[PDB]
Amino acid sequence: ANIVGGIEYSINNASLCSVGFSVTRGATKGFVTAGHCGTVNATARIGGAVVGTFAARVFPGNDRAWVSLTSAQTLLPRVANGSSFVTVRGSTEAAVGAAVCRSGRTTGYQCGTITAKNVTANYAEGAVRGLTQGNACMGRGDSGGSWITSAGQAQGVMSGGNVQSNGNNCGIPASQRSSLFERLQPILSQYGLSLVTG
């Protein structure tokens, strides 16, 4: 499969999440995603085919993971925006007030701005600390998907937020949305990964 940020993958034939970013660890191909998406060794599939397994994850506390893929996968330095793509150029962290967009299999590509950093989400499983908050909307299934600036600086991966009863926070004004992402920098250093760029 062609690995692009934002596309759907399933975990153990049950849960759905979105790919965050193509990465490599030495000769190993992988993608970073959210820790809540799977436990170590869970099976990820794209379009019904097995593409790899969860190599490591941390959740709750943090919310990160990487999936090691088979050598047949093609890694691409891109994030889906509808039928178009955003090229990944690096991982400089943007500041509060910057515009950012996120991509995921449920709500597609949505943009907003960064409103706060170092936010704690008290999920039922336990708290997740240090997340960055944005006001782009998102829904069930977007977890793990890419957060990136239009200039291509990858910011992190979708964790969670204040989903409403219709399964997203897109039906409430941007001022009332809390859409949280795990910063990418610490995931790259924690697992020794290099982002694929173009």
Partner: peptide
Amino acid sequence: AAPXXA
């Protein structure tokens, strides 16, 4: 808040 996932 809930994580997400689907």
